[PDB]
């Protein structure tokens, strides 16, 4: 039911992986 | 109650989550909906495939960028009506909180 990889989201994920907090 | 659960029966949901998990073992299938009586913004996408190595905080960041929330405003994310620790891994959260159909149901609010 329309569950696929979003190319509009992957850059955000790779951005977040570097963005550590506390 | 979730709208996604009202739209699709258990059979369809379980089939979808099993298929997803078998196709992308590194990704986590997330349903993310807005609190019914909340105030802040709601978007179009509720179906997410978020990396298992991501932390909760990083995911919160991701959805803030997705909805373009203003940097002064709060956003509170609930899982099973509780607030998960920001430093927790998504894989841990999933193993602990995944629904019977194999999806992870996430709610969010502007006020809480």
Author numbering:
A (entry chain B): 386 to 407
B (entry chain A): 2 to 113
Question: How does the study describe this entry?
Answer:
Among them, the ubiquitin-like protein Atg8 (called LC3/GABARAP proteins in humans) plays a central role. In this study, we found that in both S. pombe and Saccharomyces cerevisiae, Atg8 physically interacts with Hfl1, a vacuole membrane protein. This interaction promotes the localization of Atg8 at the vacuole membrane in a lipidation-independent manner. hfl1Δ and atg8Δ caused the same vacuole-related phenotypes, which are not shared by other atg mutants. The structures showed that the Atg8-Hfl1 interaction is mediated by noncanonical mechanisms—using Hfl1 sequences adopting helical conformation (termed helical AIMs here) and in the case of budding yeast, involving a previously unreported binding site on Atg8.
To understand the atomic details of the SpHfl1-SpAtg8 interaction, we solved the crystal structure of SpAtg8 complexed with SpHfl1(386-409) at 2.2 Å resolution. The structure of SpAtg8 is similar to other Atg8-family proteins, consisting of a ubiquitin fold and two α-helices attached at the N-terminus. The structure of SpAtg8 can be superimposed on that of ScAtg8 with an rms difference of 0.8 Å for main-chain atoms except for those of terminal tails. As a result, the two AIM-binding hydrophobic pockets (W-site and L-site) on SpAtg8 resemble those on ScAtg8 and other Atg8 homologs. SpHfl1(386-409) is comprised of an extended coil followed by an α-helix, and interacts with the W-site, the L-site, as well as α3 of SpAtg8, burying ~2000 Å2 of surface area (detailed interactions are summarized in Figure 3—figure supplement 3A). SpHfl1(386-409) forms little interaction with crystallographically adjacent SpAtg8 molecules, suggesting that the complex structure is not markedly affected by crystal packing. Strikingly, SpHfl1(386-409) neither forms an intermolecular β-sheet with β2 of Atg8 (middle), nor uses two hydrophobic residues separated by two residues to engage the W-site and the L-site. Instead, SpHfl1(386-409) uses Phe388 at the coil and Tyr398 at the helix for binding to the W-site and the L-site, respectively, with as many as nine residues between them. In addition, a hydrophobic interaction is formed between Leu386 of SpHfl1 and a hydrophobic pocket near the W-site, some electrostatic interactions are formed between the side-chains of Asp391 and Glu395 of SpHfl1 and Lys46 and Arg28 of SpAtg8, respectively, and two hydrogen bonds are formed between the main-chain of SpHfl1 and the side-chain of SpAtg8. Alanine-substitution of SpHfl1 Phe388 (F388A) and Tyr398 (Y398A), which bind to the W-site and the L-site in SpAtg8, resulted in ~4 fold and ~1000 fold decrease in the affinity with SpAtg8, respectively. This result suggests that binding to the L-site is much more important than that to the W-site for the SpHfl1-SpAtg8 interaction, which is in contrast to the interactions between canonical AIMs and Atg8 where the W-site binding is usually more important than the L-site binding.
